[PDB]
């Protein structure tokens, strides 16, 4: 019955059928994006209307369409032709990934470049890389991918060990033409292999790890109903999945006594970008919007038990559309489990004689995706004490280049002749807040140092200040770790027993934001990534910090355009957009396969509850 | 055989006997501190000399002594009378904790203050609190504790719920005299109880938590030999214990192929301080040096299985001296176990067809201590990939006050009439570095932004810079989160296969440092806490950032005095001292018992290895 249930195979085939019936999905049409829309505000009173949004590409060169379908009613709600030169190209299609290498393999310029390097064309892999927006006028309105080459010595070889530097090509994937081949000169192709399953490189595998067994003899403490509604240790939520964003959490709420108290209406990673910091023309255009351009949900891994996810795991297997509108299941694509999280609370009191210890646990909801060389784990955590956390785990194989003779200020050395260009991985979490309901506001809280003098004669006092962000023009904020800056989302109309507005405090990691010059293309296309915190007034069409169409799309849409409306956010339905990222100067230890590194944020209750919410946790 | 083995009961009784035989431990003497000394540099060639350092208090008012004993040889090496007014008072004695309440209970001023508040003296608990150094000339050279009162309604009541504000007393614990009783006026004593085991407050305990079972059917993957030598997944170390510092790690090294490579020679928390930010004269003197004044090791909890430590646990039971020199075991005072730590590395490669996943684990070495209302867990972690981490977990009951009518800039409200003064918990980790041996140096690494222009035409480039800290005068450093500042400890004479100096990078959390005015007593006594990173040249007598005697000791010793020597630290035997802390504005959720909050740091290999050190980790 829930309007927040996962899309079923049946719903996707029905969208296909409705589109077909309406003349919108003939043999030249391809689905570049398909997802269910969230219910409108206040729609719980009315009956279900499951609506799906679809981006339809045309392989014959016709203009694409954005379409909204009511699968409940079997109707097309709206269909509009897109002018991609204006509003952006559609996301990269799975089927286009092979096309760059295939077209290049019979191009005389490409073949000349490979021959100059004595490389067998049959062994040259070409990465299908998003193009962005630079100085090439002919690309405007065209679907372009750029190709960088990597040699694969044999079918099971890791091509990433053998980058072909000094060479890049641009391809029109619709007209199937190579537009440019740029050869700045030969670099040595690094020769050492990077095969992390080859016994010659690993050596004898360790025999020293004894098993760790994690079981739940009575099963898990969470329940799953209606396919994707979770109840666990007072928490209530619905686990959604979208082909762009991946796992999306809806209706995060906490049962405090008899009352189900909303906290977050929708939580997602609404964008992620990987900007590269190498000024070589071979890579200086490189910025991968994994979410917006590639769609991270689409590439979610099937997660194997006792391997990717350990313990008593409950899986969801979300369904997505293929390019023709047929349903495709991602088997075991979402892991759900609870785990022990050490000590929750502890005190041994001298005066009372009472010794007290309680254990913590967390509910974990995760998926893992692969985008070329990169693999990312997205983890959401709910804790007994009311804390909500997100963590991204970055691994995979580092994107490589040649390491220049005489070194580099923008590339590190991994192996003889092998370089790794500096880059960032920067995420945007979109938190549609609902602290005790939708009437919310945000304050920036700084620590306040005090001067020794009257009222503070010993020079020990310190304090804090809170500044309400009243309108969108004032709600673009930066970190200040030195002053312990955080942001509190409160409900000014809902007070705790001490007559204080209930709230949650966002604790950021205060990692560097986007490093690129403010006049660059990437600073404009990923403007969200230049500041740590944005607050907007909720609107149903303000979904992504980069807008709906990121691929080959200049600035003009996304967060900078949203906040220009300068709307009231002081006790209104608001959305927090938190930028957080990793700045990566690759180390030798990252090669030939990278150990996980992490980044994230959390929110902790701040006068939300009337006392600790975990007094009723039992011993042992 | 190891000179780094834990002290045995026999060694402590032997120190007692040697001191007795030498005339240094008659019936009026009390041991305030006793611990084993680390071996001297280059002492591995010579036979064992187990030496113990002892601080001896005299209850008859005679001057205390600092004594070094060779337990191996049965001799007193050195004994020196201390002038405490100059060099500091000895640590607070366990036996002094009851004395403040006992003396106050028959003092007419104290009794008058309690009678003004209608409080039964038999119900008034008095916390024995360190005094620090303020404006009271008569305290110089005297052992003083200050007392703050809390009412206990019945034997099992949590007194912390019932602070008696407006009242403080000062007591000479040797002469057994009350020096001052200060009553600034009556405040209401908060009436609600804070009894977190009372069913009336907890409500019915949850029945929803299903068991989680963590077992190791073949046992743990680590070995323990010689009592305290750990070998685990290429790591090698010795787990020490000291009554002041608690768990101390020695000889942290990693077996890389055939070579045992040192990383850290000694790691400890060498100080921790809890400064309060309430300018009321009742608490404005409050700064608890839990390590330096109270000795955190002394109060280590006995940790219960399946409760404090979960899984297949190996315990150490360290032995300490009581006040008379008799050995006392802290049963199960140190937990050691390994645990699963999610995904280590993962890649699913399109071109090779190879899908690869490996799991991480960490070795955990921990203890938990209780200092009055506070309880702290100290956790050291070693990871498969070479990462070393420390985490402090803070819990217990918040230190309380009245909440003033009309509010406070320096105190938060927890319950009706109940306040919690703002404070910090600030730790100093002393890391005696040995990156591939003792010849080490530290660089500060900042991210470097670059301007769009020639050489960077697209405005995408970014870089980094490293600054070697060459001498101690240049090695007092602050955080800069915005520029991604870290510190790399390298060995300039030990190069990896890429001809780069091997190293480890310290990643701080960049939390605020000491907030107090720079002219305060606490800014001088805890000078270390004002800056994030200090580097010194190693010396055997530079043990604590606050010096040997912290109790009632002004500035003059510790880190500021050490670095004045301006010694060479560029390719020398050096020590890194990292300040990190929590700034606590207590929330209603912290009452009546605080959920754990955490702070820490980690160090990751940075070109230490020639490639990933976890290629030989097996599947599943
Ligand atoms: Cu990276
Ligand atoms: Cu605290
Ligand atoms: Na909202
Ligand atoms: Na050293």
UniProtKB/Swiss-Prot annotation, chains A, B:
A GO molecular function assigned to this protein is: primary methylamine oxidase activity
In terms of Pfam families, this protein maps to: AGAO-like_N2, Cu_amine_oxid
Q: Which Gene3D superfamilies match?
A: 3.10.450.40, Copper amine oxidase, catalytic domain
What's a GO biological-process term for it? amine metabolic process
Coiled coil located at which positions?
none
Q: Where is the PTM 2',4',5'-topaquinone found along the chain?
A: 374
Q: Which residues bind substrate?
A: 288-299, 371-376
The protein's matches in InterPro entries, at most eight in alphabetical order, are given as:
AGAO-like_N2, Cu_Am_Ox_Cu-bd, Cu_Am_ox_TPQ-bd, Cu_amine_oxidase, Cu_amine_oxidase_C, Cu_amine_oxidase_C_sf, Cu_amine_oxidase_N-reg
Report whether Chloroplast shows up as a keyword of the record.
Answer: no
Catalytic activity line of the entry: a primary methyl amine + O2 + H2O = an aldehyde + H2O2 + NH4(+); 2-phenylethylamine + O2 + H2O = 2-phenylacetaldehyde + H2O2 + NH4(+)
Task: Give a short account of what the protein does.
Answer: Catalyzes the oxidative deamination of phenylethylamine to phenylacetaldehyde with the concomitant production of hydrogen peroxide and ammonia.
Tell me the protein's name: Phenylethylamine oxidase
């Amino acid at each position: 019955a829930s309007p927040f249930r996962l899309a079923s195979a049946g719903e996707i085939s029905e969208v296909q059928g409705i589109l077909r019936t309406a003349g919108l999905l003939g043999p030249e049409k391809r689905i570049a994006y398909l997802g269910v829309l969230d219910p409108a505000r206040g729609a719980g009173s009315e009956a279900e209307d499951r609506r799906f949004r679809v981006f339809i590409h045309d392989v014959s060169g016709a203009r694409p369409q954005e379409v909204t379908v009511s699968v409940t009613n079997g109707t097309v709600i709206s269909a509009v032709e897109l002018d991609t030169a204006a509003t952006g190209e559609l996301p990269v299609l799975e089927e286009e990934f092979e096309v760059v290498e295939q077209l290049l393999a019979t191009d005389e310029r490409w073949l000349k470049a490979l021959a100059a390097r004595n490389l067998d064309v049959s062994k040259v892999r070409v990465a299908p890389l998003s193009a962005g927006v630079f100085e090439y006028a002919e690309e405007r309105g065209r679907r372009i991918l750029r190709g960088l080459a990597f040699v694969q010595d044999f079918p099971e070889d890791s091509a990433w060990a053998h980058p072909v530097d000094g060479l890049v090509a641009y391809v029109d994937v619709v007209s199937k033409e190579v537009t440019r081949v740029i050869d700045t000169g030969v670099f040595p192709v690094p020769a050492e292999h990077g095969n992390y399953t080859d016994p010659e490189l690993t050596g004898p595998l360790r025999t020293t790890q004894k098993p760790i067994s994690i079981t739940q003899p009575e099963g898990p403490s969470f329940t799953v109903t209606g396919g994707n509604h979770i109840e666990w240790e007072k928490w209530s939520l619905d686990v959604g999945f979208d082909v762009r964003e991946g796992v999306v959490l809806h209706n995060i709420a906490f049962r405090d006594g008899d009352r189900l108290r909303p906290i977050i209406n929708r939580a997602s990673i609404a964008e992620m970008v990987v900007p590269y910091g190498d000024p070589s023309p071979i890579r200086s255009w490189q910025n991968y919007f994994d979410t917006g351009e590639y769609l991270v949900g689409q590439y979610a891994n099937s997660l194997e038990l006792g391997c990717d996810c350990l313990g008593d795991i409950t899986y969801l297997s979300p369904v997505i559309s293929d390019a023709f509108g047929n349903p495709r299941e991602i088997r075991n694509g979402i892991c759900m489990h609870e785990e022990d999280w050490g000590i929750l609370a502890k005190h041994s009191d001298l005066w009372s004689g009472i010794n007290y210890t309680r254990r913590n646990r967390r509910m974990v909801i995760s998926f893992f995706t692969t985008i070329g060389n990169y693999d990312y784990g997205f983890y959401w955590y709910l804790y007994l004490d009311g804390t909500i956390e997100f963590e991204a785990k970055a691994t995979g194989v580092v994107f490589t280049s040649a390491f220049p003779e005489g070194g580099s200020d923008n590339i590190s050395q991994l192996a003889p002749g092998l370089g790794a260009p500096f880059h960032q991985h920067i995420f945007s979490a979109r938190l549609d807040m609902a602290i005790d309901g939708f009437t919310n506001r945000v304050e920036e809280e700084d620590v306040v140092r005090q001067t020794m003098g009257p009222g503070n004669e010993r020079g020990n006092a310190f304090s804090r200040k809170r500044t309400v962000l009243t309108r969108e023009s004032e709600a673009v904020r930066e970190a200040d770790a030195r002053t312990g800056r955080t942001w509190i989302i409160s409900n000014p109309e809902s007070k705790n027993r001490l007559n204080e507005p209930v709230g949650y405090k966002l604790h950021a990691h205060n990692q560097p934001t986007l490093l690129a010059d403010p006049g660059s293309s990437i600073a404009r296309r990923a403007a969200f990534a230049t500041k740590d915190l944005w607050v907007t007034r909720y609107a149903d069409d303000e979904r992504y910090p980069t807008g709906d169409f990121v691929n080959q799309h200049s600035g003009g849409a996304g967060l900078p355009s949203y906040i220009a409306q300068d709307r009231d956010i002081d006790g209104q339905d608001i959305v927090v957009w938190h930028t957080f990222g990793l700045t990566h100067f690759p180390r030798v230890e990252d090669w030939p396969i990278m150990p996980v590194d992490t980044v994230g944020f959390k929110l902790r209750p701040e006068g939300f509850f009337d006392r600790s919410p975990v007094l009723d946790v039992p011993a042992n």
